[PDB]
Design an enzyme around this catalytic site. Structure first.
Site, PDB file in Angstrom:
ATOM      1  N   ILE A 290       0.821  -1.198   0.000  1.00  0.00           N
ATOM      2  CA  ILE A 290       0.000   0.000   0.000  1.00  0.00           C
ATOM      3  C   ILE A 290       0.870   1.269   0.000  1.00  0.00           C
ATOM      4  CG2 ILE A 290      -1.771   1.311   1.258  1.00  0.00           C
ATOM      5  CD1 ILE A 290      -2.616  -1.625   2.406  1.00  0.00           C
ATOM      6  N   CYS A 291       0.645   2.149  -0.980  1.00  0.00           N
ATOM      7  CA  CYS A 291       1.337   3.445  -1.062  1.00  0.00           C
ATOM      8  C   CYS A 291       0.491   4.536  -0.439  1.00  0.00           C
ATOM      9  CB  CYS A 291       1.630   3.834  -2.518  1.00  0.00           C
ATOM     10  SG  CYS A 291       2.408   2.566  -3.500  1.00  0.00           S
ATOM     11  N   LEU A 292       0.617   4.696   0.877  1.00  0.00           N
ATOM     12  CA  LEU A 292       0.007   5.794   1.595  1.00  0.00           C
ATOM     13  C   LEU A 292       1.069   6.350   2.512  1.00  0.00           C
ATOM     14  CD1 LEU A 292      -3.556   4.404   2.641  1.00  0.00           C
ATOM     15  CD2 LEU A 292      -3.089   6.271   0.982  1.00  0.00           C
TER      16      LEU A 292
END
Ligand code: NA
EC number: 2.3.2.23
Length: 123
Positions: A96-98
């Site tokens: 996840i790219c957060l």
């Protein structure tokens, strides 16, 4: 070489097997000596895609993994299993790219706030 201290809290069998990889690994393989972690806690949260979104009716799974350094160290959170969301900020591997999970993590934040950010990402 693996930091010695990383073997303090390690089960005796895992110590022998780790050292065997460090010292006599099988062909084509090399231990990542910076990768060793102990006292990890994990669990899975089932997540449903929200009504009215592109993910409506989808069933996802979120794996939460907490190092011995949590909450100062960010939790590792990723989608897991056979159904991984199709979204620019989610890789095929479930990553996840957060920013909350990386640059903007703080022990002031929480599992709940991570959940909210992920809900927000899928709308
Ligand atoms: Na982390």
């Amino acid at each position: 070489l693996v930091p010695r201290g990383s073997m303090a809290s390690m089960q005796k069998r895992l110590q022998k097997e780790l050292l065997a990889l460090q010292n006599d690994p099988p062909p084509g393989m090399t231990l990542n000596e910076k990768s060793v972690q102990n006292s990890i806690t994990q669990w899975i949260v089932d997540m449903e895609g929200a009504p009215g979104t592109l993910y409506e009716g989808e069933k996802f799974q979120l794996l939460f993994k907490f190092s011995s350094r949590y909450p100062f160290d960010s939790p590792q959170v990723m989608f897991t299993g056979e159904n991984i969301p199709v979204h620019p900020h989610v890789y095929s591997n479930g990553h996840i790219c957060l920013s909350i999970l990386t640059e903007d993590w703080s022990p002031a934040l929480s599992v709940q706030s991570v959940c909210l950010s992920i809900i927000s990402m899928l709308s």
